């Protein structure tokens, strides 16, 4: 079931024609890899295509669409383990798991992502500072490697090196077929949330450094990257935790695990309204309200700067607002500890996502941003990238050589390849 198809990432740029295999038959997939391994443009897995860049395409090669492998094999409330095919998506998983009092332990800002894509990008969420990234919660996975064998990987077993190279490995160690995830127990589908509004970058940072982060499992902020200082870096901060049944109002206690401008705006009254609106304590909120509040020709850019380099982070934010490039939708968060995966994106520090309209000079400006991010100890996220250079990437990820070595062992013939692997010289 092969079709020549034109593939892009979610950004709809850097287009690339590939032979797309789409089949629910795992044995067909094993044979397609073993076939590619005989004859040399290789293969890469694809999930739901929500990564903005070029990690899920392979120009003139094979792309295996994993979404048809979407069986949930089992869910267990006592062990908190789910056993699922890699093509299962987090929305599907959230729905299926709620009736067991289980919560998907790491959720990104859209639930249309596959488990395979979640592992391969080692995705993070609003709870990174309390929960780590997705890879921290994988207890096993079955990896179809270049030799056509399916390998059972665990984080502390004898194949730990390959497991942790696969986490964050952008599909370049093989095809994740199936995994077991440890879910988070919950008594409800709701959050209890506190809101705070700051008037400056200095305050934003202050709020995230005063120790209050430890009282919240989930935390993120909308961020002003346009206004000149002092307003620059002012934020609507939303923080919280999963509610217990005891904390819900009467109306919702019976089904606790359910799911289902003007002239004033820019002046003093507007400022007061927004400040009041964004300030609250103990507000009960569902998933959409707390986690996806947005449900009511761009360049996506995300970077993190090590915690200690706070002055340097501020400098970068100033560079952005003074650039002449205007990003209105900005997400800020303080990441917590990193994990063992050599290519994992998150590190403890100041994370920000920005979104720039594509216009003259942007390309060259974002290259300079890369340079500053690199210089200040930070990195970019592959899930949001199609334009950075191999030299920059390699310097941002000093464990890349360590990772490349692992990849060479498991794929000596370069059976697995993508546009991204060639661009960033991970091939
Ligand atoms: C609106 C929006 C919000 C987002 N918010 C966040 C966020 O808050 N946090 C965050 O971390 N990310 C976020 N992302 C990025 C997204 O979580 C990742 O890009 C994710 O990897 C996409 O999953 P996918 O199934 O669509 O994978 P694809 O984009 O199809 O593939 C991405 C990578 O995963 C690999 N892959 C997919 N399936 C398999 C498999 N079975 N075996 C091996 N490799 C595989 C591919 O080869 C590729 O390298 C967001 C994206 C969007 C569009
Ligand atoms: N940046 O991609 C980013 C980061 C985080 C983080 F807090 F976990 F770090 C969350 C996050 C999100 O929830 N949603 C994002 N989307 C959807 C809403 C509009 C902008 C893109 S981005 C994001």
Residue numbers in the entry: 7 to 45, 48 to 268, 284 to 319, 331 to 461
From the paper:
DprE1 is the first of two enzymes that catalyze the conversion of decaprenylphosphoryl-β-D-ribose (DPR) to decaprenylphosphoryl-β-D-arabinose (DPA). We obtained co-crystal structures of Mtb-DprE1 with BTZ compounds 1, 2, 9, and 12 and BOZ compound 5.
Compound 2 is the four-electron reduced form of 7, also referred to as hydroxylamino-BTZ, and was synthesized as a potential noncovalent inhibitor control. However, it turned out to be a novel mechanism-based suicide substrate (see later). The progress curves for 2 were also time dependent, which was not expected given that this hydroxylamine compound is the two-electron reduced form of the nitroso derivative, 1. These data could be explained if 2 is an alternative substrate of Mtb-DprE1 that reduces Eox to generate an ERED:1 complex, followed by covalent bond formation with Cys387. This hypothesis was further confirmed by X-ray data (see below) that clearly indicate a covalent bond to Cys387. Therefore, 2 is a true mechanism-based suicide substrate of Mtb-DprE1 because substrate (DPR or FPR) is not required for covalent modification of Cys387 to occur. Very remarkably, 2 was very potent in the enzyme assay, surpassing its nitro analogue, 7.
